[PDB]
Enzyme design. Structure first.
Site, PDB file in Angstrom:
ATOM      1  CE1 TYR A  82      -2.942  -3.088   1.424  1.00  0.00           C
ATOM      2  CE2 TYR A  82      -4.448  -1.750   0.028  1.00  0.00           C
ATOM      3  CZ  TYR A  82      -4.166  -3.079   0.636  1.00  0.00           C
ATOM      4  OH  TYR A  82      -5.420  -3.941   0.023  1.00  0.00           O
ATOM      5  N   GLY A 142       2.849   3.968  -1.695  1.00  0.00           N
ATOM      6  CA  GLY A 142       2.613   4.594  -2.287  1.00  0.00           C
ATOM      7  C   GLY A 142       2.147   4.584  -4.178  1.00  0.00           C
ATOM      8  N   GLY A 161      -0.739   2.170  -3.297  1.00  0.00           N
ATOM      9  CA  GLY A 161      -2.129   1.541  -2.787  1.00  0.00           C
ATOM     10  C   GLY A 161      -2.444   0.462  -3.630  1.00  0.00           C
ATOM     11  CG  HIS A 210      -2.089   7.858   4.741  1.00  0.00           C
ATOM     12  ND1 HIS A 210      -0.966   8.337   3.469  1.00  0.00           N
ATOM     13  CD2 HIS A 210      -1.963   9.193   5.464  1.00  0.00           C
ATOM     14  CE1 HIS A 210      -1.160   9.604   3.176  1.00  0.00           C
ATOM     15  NE2 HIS A 210      -1.675   9.927   3.576  1.00  0.00           N
ATOM     16  CG  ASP A 211      -3.805   3.790   0.305  1.00  0.00           C
ATOM     17  OD1 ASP A 211      -2.355   4.747  -0.176  1.00  0.00           O
ATOM     18  OD2 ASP A 211      -3.606   2.753  -0.759  1.00  0.00           O
ATOM     19  CE1 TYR A 228      -3.749  11.807   2.718  1.00  0.00           C
ATOM     20  CE2 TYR A 228      -3.007  10.720   0.711  1.00  0.00           C
ATOM     21  CZ  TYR A 228      -2.950  11.804   1.526  1.00  0.00           C
ATOM     22  OH  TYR A 228      -1.528  12.354   2.036  1.00  0.00           O
ATOM     23  CE1 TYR A 278       0.304  18.790   6.073  1.00  0.00           C
ATOM     24  CE2 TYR A 278      -0.940  17.943   4.092  1.00  0.00           C
ATOM     25  CZ  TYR A 278      -0.292  17.927   4.772  1.00  0.00           C
ATOM     26  OH  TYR A 278       0.515  16.772   5.269  1.00  0.00           O
ATOM     27  CG  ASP A 309      -0.259  13.737   4.563  1.00  0.00           C
ATOM     28  OD1 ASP A 309      -0.564  12.613   4.179  1.00  0.00           O
ATOM     29  OD2 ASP A 309      -0.765  14.537   3.419  1.00  0.00           O
TER      30      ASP A 309
HETATM   31  O1  LIG Z   1       1.175   6.241   2.134  1.00  0.00           O
HETATM   32  C1  LIG Z   1       2.325   5.935   1.492  1.00  0.00           C
HETATM   33  O2  LIG Z   1       3.373   5.954   2.440  1.00  0.00           O
HETATM   34  C2  LIG Z   1       2.805   7.341   0.580  1.00  0.00           C
HETATM   35  C3  LIG Z   1       2.166   7.474  -0.648  1.00  0.00           C
HETATM   36  C4  LIG Z   1       0.667   6.923  -0.836  1.00  0.00           C
HETATM   37  C5  LIG Z   1      -0.199   7.820  -1.839  1.00  0.00           C
HETATM   38  C6  LIG Z   1       0.478   8.069  -2.868  1.00  0.00           C
HETATM   39  C7  LIG Z   1       1.572   8.650  -2.616  1.00  0.00           C
HETATM   40  C8  LIG Z   1       2.658   8.347  -1.671  1.00  0.00           C
HETATM   41  N1  LIG Z   1       3.818   8.468  -1.736  1.00  0.00           N
HETATM   42  C9  LIG Z   1       4.345   9.686  -1.733  1.00  0.00           C
HETATM   43  C10 LIG Z   1       5.236  10.526  -1.902  1.00  0.00           C
HETATM   44 CL1  LIG Z   1       4.892  10.528   0.130  1.00  0.00          CL
HETATM   45  C11 LIG Z   1       6.029  11.109  -3.130  1.00  0.00           C
HETATM   46  C12 LIG Z   1       6.252  11.412  -4.533  1.00  0.00           C
HETATM   47  C13 LIG Z   1       5.218  10.721  -4.746  1.00  0.00           C
HETATM   48  C14 LIG Z   1       4.940   9.563  -3.805  1.00  0.00           C
HETATM   49 CL2  LIG Z   1       3.968   8.686  -4.879  1.00  0.00          CL
END
Ligand SMILES: O=C(O)Cc1ccccc1Nc1c(Cl)cccc1Cl
Length: 121
Positions: free
Chosen positions: A27, A29, A31, A47-48, A51, A64, A89
């Site tokens: 999940y 990055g 998910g 976290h997903d 959102y 924010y 976050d």
């Molecule tokens: O929940 C997480 O660990 C992080 C997360 C969730 C959903 C979408 C992106 C990210 N992270 C992410 C970040 Cl934090 C920076 C650059 C690019 C990406 Cl894709």
């Protein structure tokens, strides 16, 4: 916005969002599916989901403002989306910090096919 979240991550964990948490587990990055591989992965799942409660908001791009009261994270008043995005976050950062002790590099770049099954929020 993604830009604030990573900075929050770094301050909190000493690790860089990319590549430490951008492709972790099932999940972090991107998910999508499967069973969260661990606590860190669980933080991302929640976290997903967080959102997910904000269909009409834009987490990746809406910025924010937040401050640190001694070492606490405090979300400053903004638009409602902005406030709820921040709370999402903030939770994830604290969570990451709380499981840094079990963070595992074998879950970095985890392959997609190894994430099976839907899990409801
Ligand atoms: O929940 C997480 O660990 C992080 C997360 C969730 C959903 C979408 C992106 C990210 N992270 C992410 C970040 Cl934090 C920076 C650059 C690019 C990406 Cl894709």
């Amino acid at each position: 916005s993604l830009l604030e979240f990573g900075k929050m991550i770094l301050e909190e964990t000493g690790k860089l969002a990319i590549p430490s948490y951008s492709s972790y587990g099932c999940y972090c990055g991107w998910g999508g599916k499967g069973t969260p591989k661990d606590a860190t992965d669980r933080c991302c799942f929640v976290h997903d989901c967080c959102y997910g409660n904000l269909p009409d908001c834009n987490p990746k791009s809406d910025r924010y403002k937040y401050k640190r009261v001694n070492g606490a994270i405090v979300c400053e008043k903004g638009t409602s989306c902005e406030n709820r995005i921040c709370e999402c976050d903030k939770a994830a950062a604290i969570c990451f910090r709380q499981n840094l002790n079990t963070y595992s590099k074998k879950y970095m770049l985890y392959p997609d096919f190894l994430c099976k099954g839907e899990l409801k929020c």
